[PDB]
Write a protein that binds this ligand. Structure first.
Ligand code: HEM
Length: 212
């Protein structure tokens, strides 16, 4: 069984739970406000910063290298633009760093520094989602908060280097299938993907509570 199919199969159940989280459920209803949106994007800023730091650390490592797509996928730069938009010129010392966000970042550094063969699970979970449901969320956000079609405030959801998200995802899945695979690595990569999804769910549950 190809890794791409193993991952989709392994995370299909938890994905349902994730997309139905209270925060996401509200977001999908169009019920999303500046306060809540700023909290989640600031949290993603920290998460992608950690993820991409570990990707750079392991860019030449065979267990990840085939999936090294900084130009097409990396979100750090985009998130910095969004942080300046939502939090202003000095967003650096204004943005929050919640406990659940810190927990996610902690696991990312553990994986990147100690278990790099599992990094693919984290890139898969975040990037492929951004190119899927994230695109629907972008449209909901624009309508709900009156964000311009020009993109300001939603740079994170925009991929100027990817003409067709659907085609790119197919390319990415194919590339994941070229990674050196053994039963041990395949088993743990799918388990780590489940963990990645749980870290996201816990983040959303935390943000929803903070807003409430
Ligand atoms: C806001 C609720 C969400 C919606 C509407 C949604 C919807 C979708 C849709 C329609 C697909 C299928 C795309 C395809 O076949 O190419 C998809 C795939 C995916 N989503 Fe979500 N999603 C949501 C939340 C999430 C969350 C919270 C995560 C985890 C950070 C996530 C990660 C993924 C991943 C990793 C895939 C790719 C699965 C695969 O092809 O193997 N999604 N999502």
């Amino acid at each position: 069984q190809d890794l791409s199919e193993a991952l989709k199969e392994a995370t299909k159940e938890v994905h349902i739970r994730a997309e139905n989280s209270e925060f996401m459920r509200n977001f999908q209803k169009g019920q999303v406000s500046r306060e809540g949106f700023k909290l989640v994007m600031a949290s993603l800023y920290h998460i992608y910063t950690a993820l991409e730091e570990e990707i750079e650390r392991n860019k030449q490592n065979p267990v990840y290298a085939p999936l090294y797509f900084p130009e097409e996928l990396h979100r750090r730069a985009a998130l910095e633009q969004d942080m300046a938009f939502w939090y202003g010129p000095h967003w650096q010392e204004a943005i929050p760093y919640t406990p659940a966000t810190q927990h996610y970042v902690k696991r990312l550094h553990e994986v990147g520094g100690t278990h790099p063969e599992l990094l693919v699970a984290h890139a898969y979970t975040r990037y492929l989602g951004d190119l899927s449901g994230g695109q629907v969320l972008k449209k909901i956000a624009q309508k709900a908060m009156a964000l311009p079609s020009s993109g300001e405030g939603l740079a994170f959801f925009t991929f100027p280097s990817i003409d067709n998200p659907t085609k790119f995802k197919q390319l990415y899945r194919a590339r994941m299938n070229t990674l050196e695979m053994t039963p041990e690595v395949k088993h743990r990569v799918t388990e780590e993907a489940k963990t990645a999804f749980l870290l996201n769910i816990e983040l959303f549950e935390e943000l929803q509570a903070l807003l409430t």
